[PDB]
Amino acid sequence: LNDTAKRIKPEMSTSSHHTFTHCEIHPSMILGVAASIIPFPDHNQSPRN
Amino acid sequence: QERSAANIVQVFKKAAPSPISHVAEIRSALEKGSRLISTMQIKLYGREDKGTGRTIKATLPYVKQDIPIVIVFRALGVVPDGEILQHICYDENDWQMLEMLKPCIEEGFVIQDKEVALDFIGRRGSAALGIRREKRIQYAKDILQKELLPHITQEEGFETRKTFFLGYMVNRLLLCALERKDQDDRDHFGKKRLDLAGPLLANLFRILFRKLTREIYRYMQRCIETDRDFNLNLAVKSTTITSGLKYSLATGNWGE
Amino acid sequence: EITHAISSAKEQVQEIIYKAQHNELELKPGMTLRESFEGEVSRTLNDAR
Amino acid sequence: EDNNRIISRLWRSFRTVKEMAADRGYFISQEEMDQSLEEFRSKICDSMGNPQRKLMSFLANPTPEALEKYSDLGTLWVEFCDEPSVGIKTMRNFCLRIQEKNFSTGIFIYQNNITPSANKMIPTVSPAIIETFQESDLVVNITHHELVPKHIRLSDGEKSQLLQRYKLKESQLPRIQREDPVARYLGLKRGQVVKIIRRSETSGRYASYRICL
Amino acid sequence: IAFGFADRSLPHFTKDDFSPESKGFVENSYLRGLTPQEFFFHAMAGREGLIDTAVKTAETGYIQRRLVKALEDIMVHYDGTTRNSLGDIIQFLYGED
Amino acid sequence: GLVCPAETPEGQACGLVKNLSLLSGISIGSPSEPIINFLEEWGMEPLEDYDPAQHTKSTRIFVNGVWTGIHRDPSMLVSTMRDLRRSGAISPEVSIIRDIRE
Amino acid sequence: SFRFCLECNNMLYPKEDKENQRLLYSCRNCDYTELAEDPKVYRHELITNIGETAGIVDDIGQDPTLPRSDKECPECHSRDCVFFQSQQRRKDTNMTLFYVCLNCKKTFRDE
Amino acid sequence: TPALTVYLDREIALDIEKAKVIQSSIEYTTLKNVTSATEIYYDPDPTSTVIEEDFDTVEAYFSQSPWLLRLELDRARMLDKQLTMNQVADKISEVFSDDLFVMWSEDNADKLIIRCRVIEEDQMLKRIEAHMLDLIALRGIPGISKVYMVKHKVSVPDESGEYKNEELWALETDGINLAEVMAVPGVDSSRTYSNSFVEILSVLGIEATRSSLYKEILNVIAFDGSYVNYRHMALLVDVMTSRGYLMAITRHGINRADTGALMRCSF
RNA sequence: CAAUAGGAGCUUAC
Ligand SMILES: [Zn+2]
Ligand SMILES: [Zn+2]
């Protein structure tokens, strides 16, 4: 790990054992048609998106 | 079009200069057609520390004044107060809620049978003045049967299920009033529905086709007087549905 | 340095949470225990940033 | 116990009344000004300690300066009544006594309330003037407050000078209600103009004038 | 960030989790990139800002119109006084200086 | 996951006009008769046999906002309903929502 | 907790036997009057706690969204427990938690 | 959010115990604030009891209606307001002089209890209990629901004439009752201030109202570091206080003037 | 030397 470049995936330390029931197919699918054109929308402040 | 869901009970807090504090609101609709029919609130009069009577009073559709709850429970066919409480109280051991339930029982102690309570409802049915008891009862019984929770059922002989749903609504009201459960979220997206082309065109077509059938009636009143056979191809003005659908889809104004 | 400061603030917030959960947090005048907890956490995170 | 507190509040109210009289222009003996709580308790209270409010009622005469300045300034009567509620009976007695000894102004300090039926006799007792105050209101002298600048009622000649200097009519001035606490404290009648000098952060000093409704 | 779901901000968190990440702390920078959760929380905050900008301007414009109508007739006159259209004095000297 | 968090008009329509997420879908509606039949098979007891003096632990079942019965053991009912939906026997766009505290 | 009539099935209200000075309970519909056990007639509370442990079911272990803790069951030494805070939602409520064993099903606390 | 700023007398203003005593004097407590749970017992014989805790107490208190009120008083709540049983029982007798007879358990008693007797009465007791719980005052000024012990960094000259900071205890409150708090001994009666300038007008006059109005407007503007020149806010507060009373910036204020009809209609 | 009105909807910049 310890990658100073890739973003830190959250620690999630409070919970001892996770029991997942579902997974996102891909997180970028939360956006709609118009927001899907934006490249790297996770590097912008939301009003600009 | 985005709209709140139908046939779900939601309980809301109220404001300081309001005698009403807690309101359970349900809108009703049928599985066939998915159209609204009637709405029926159950409000909690009495503010915190003011308004000494913390009673709960319903609001039936097609009646001007709000009826107490025990009155309508008796009118629906469960007279003994033990059974009324049991329809409201699932767990006798709980005591705070039962302590908040007495003023309703006291404000509706007068009634002891179904006929008198159902008349008491009838005396408020917003109809013409001076109907005699035997048909005031029929009018009120019709209101209690249809236009009261049509989603439950609209046929007679199944009043117990409506009483149980009323007990559930009152219990959720009290849970919100006794702080044992949180108030319903207005902005929650799971309590909303989206009306696409299907239901929108269904509503508009229902309106315009009832227009057409009224036209058919208004033609069969006259033409039948002549005592002639008619081929029904001059009895339907086809331009009504066409003009209505075209007007709504071309302007956007959804209605006549 | 930045990630160390953020981790230290996360530990501080976790300690505030522990103190609030075992009922040992010191309230403030005109302010509830839950509002005191929230105010202290907001102070910590603003100072972290 | 609670009697000491009642006596102290009554003494503070009495000192406020005397400060009112001296501010309004009446002569007050310097020794009765500095009336202290214990000496007041000696001269007023009883063996049981409860106070006789009928001895506090005094008579004040105008200082000669407030006569050379306010020529319309007569003689004052101040009565602390003993009945908490005051009705038309007591107001009738007060007006009879005021007209009986041609007192120009009569201040009637009451305890609890003055009923409207009694209150209607207050203005119909010309040419004397009757004003009433409640003791609870008089506990603090509000003209000593930092936010309350010093009000000084003008004389007729000075009011005319004020109106002519600004080429003004009476209705074009800022106004003060006769029921204003500082107009009530000063015994302002309709048409009289106070002058209000006050702090000014842009100029240092600023003189304001208000006319009485 | 409020518990919009039942006892949580997002359905990717557990119940009653008060940690900074659950309730709207964004640990990354814009250069590093936001996670989907941080992206959604930042979207809620930006949406709140846009609503505020859109909605308060009407109250502000109403307030400024009422102030202008209340003060529209007030002028400093040649004698130094500050009077309205009725000639009534508002200040005997403008600004007191 | 349901409406785009970024696409919304500026101005007076802000937040009222929404835009669907790419994988969003709107239900068409479905007959409730097979649902009721499946519920009746697996053990739901009706409200004409209901007595809250005894049923202090039973879980109450709502169908389309209509309270239709109670069950002694929601675990196997939700498991079987989810398996039926995931096998195709039930329309895939049918919600199967267990609430545990209530 | 007010009772109900053994004959008329309505609810009984208090009354006084002035010839015996004992608190009975009077039916406002029928004439039946039974002896009571408890002389309490009224109650009122402002500091209440109903809803502390009530937010628990048998199958609360089946909730997959509840966070799981390592607290020791004092009862059953279980190293796996789901936990949650007071389910009462008032403003002045505590923030102490509750702990449910998935092994022993006893609810406990950390005190 | 109504609020007073109660400046204390200097002797109090430096000591903290004295400031807390003044706080206790200014704060409002009702029987609600110190009451846990009220009961009702049927006690047919006044000289005896059907209960088992207070029998010894009433046998030590002796050597009407059989309806009894048994209200319980929590310990720490009683403890925090410097209140004991004597003042509470006296206060109850103050408004129930002879239409009520009050018994009260002692303060060291393992159960803090109060017993009352009426002189069918199972509902007048409920009404009286409600009226007591909702209208009996114990100490303080009505209208002051909370009080805080605040610190003010006043700048005062030294004995050399040079300005030096000085750390004094003052008071902030919730709610408003200006007239009664100004009178309370230990308060600087010449400096008490309210953030509701309608109260100022009713109590202190119109010039003090103008001063308070300017203070509020300056606070609202300068909150965020904005600076508006003095004369603009002075003009705004002078227009609002020119008639002798507060003229609101609304149609109900602007259109009740004597100006021409066309101006008023144009607004 | 003469280019309708009323509505609704979508947008622009604050
Ligand atoms: Zn009976
Ligand atoms: Zn165990």
UniProtKB/TrEMBL annotation, chain C:
Protein's cellular compartments: Nucleus
Residue ranges crossing the lipid bilayer per the database entry: none
Domain of life: Eukaryota
Family label: Belongs to the RNA polymerase beta' chain family.
Function per UniProt: DNA-dependent RNA polymerase catalyzes the transcription of DNA into RNA using the four ribonucleoside triphosphates as substrates.
Protein name: DNA-directed RNA polymerase subunit
Segment of the intact protein contained: 679 to 727 of 1743
From TrEMBL, chain D:
Protein source organism: Komagataella phaffii (strain GS115 / ATCC 20864) (Yeast)
Superkingdom: Eukaryota
Record-stated family: Belongs to the archaeal Rpo5/eukaryotic RPB5 RNA polymerase subunit family.
Subcellular localization(s) per the UniProt record: Nucleus
Domain RNA polymerase subunit H/Rpb5 C-terminal residue range list: 140-212
Gene Ontology molecular function terms on file: DNA binding; DNA-directed RNA polymerase activity; RNA-directed RNA polymerase activity
Pfam families according to UniProt: RNA_pol_Rpb5_C, RNA_pol_Rpb5_N
PROSITE patterns per the UniProt record, alphabetical: RNA_POL_H_23KD
Any Gene Ontology CC annotation: RNA polymerase I complex
Residue span(s) of domain RNA polymerase Rpb5 N-terminal: 6-97
UniProt KW keywords: Nucleus, Transcription
Swiss-Prot/TrEMBL GO biological process terms: termination of RNA polymerase I transcription; termination of RNA polymerase III transcription; transcription elongation by RNA polymerase I; transcription elongation by RNA polymerase II; transcription initiation at RNA polymerase I promoter; transcription initiation at RNA polymerase II promoter; transcription initiation at RNA polymerase III promoter; tRNA transcription by RNA polymerase III
Name of the protein this chain belongs to: DNA-directed RNA polymerases I, II, and III subunit RPABC1
UniProtKB/TrEMBL annotation, chain F:
Secretion signal span: none
Domain RNA polymerase Rpb2: residue ranges: 61-102
Protein origin, superkingdom: Eukaryota
Cellular compartment(s): Nucleus
Entry's family note: Belongs to the RNA polymerase beta chain family.
Subunit: Component of the RNA polymerase II (Pol II) complex consisting of 12 subunits.
Function: DNA-dependent RNA polymerase catalyzes the transcription of DNA into RNA using the four ribonucleoside triphosphates as substrates.
Protein name, entry field: DNA-directed RNA polymerase subunit beta
Species in which this protein is naturally found: Komagataella phaffii (strain GS115 / ATCC 20864) (Yeast)
TrEMBL record, chain G:
Binding site for Zn(2+) 4: E7
C4-type Zn finger ranges: 5-30
GO molecular function: DNA-directed RNA polymerase activity; nucleic acid binding; zinc ion binding
Domain TFIIS-type, chain residue ranges per copy: 69-109
CDD domains in alphabetical order: Zn-ribbon_RPB9
Positions contributing to Zn(2+) 2 binding: C5, C8, C27, C30, C73, C76, C101, C104
GO cellular component: nucleolus; RNA polymerase II, core complex
Positions contributing to Zn(2+) 7 binding: C27, C30
Keywords: DNA-directed RNA polymerase, Metal-binding, Nucleus, Transcription, Zinc, Zinc-finger
Major localisation: nucleus
Binding-site positions, Zn(2+) 3: C5, C30
Residues annotated for Zn(2+) 6 binding in this entry: C27
Subcellular location: Nucleus, Nucleolus
Protein function: DNA-dependent RNA polymerase catalyzes the transcription of DNA into RNA using the four ribonucleoside triphosphates as substrates.
Subunit structure: Component of the RNA polymerase II (Pol II) complex consisting of 12 subunits.
Protein name from the UniProt record: DNA-directed RNA polymerase subunit
Originating species: Komagataella phaffii (strain ATCC 76273 / CBS 7435 / CECT 11047 / NRRL Y-11430 / Wegner 21-1) (Yeast)
The organism's taxonomic lineage, starting at the top: Eukaryota, Fungi, Dikarya, Ascomycota, Saccharomycotina
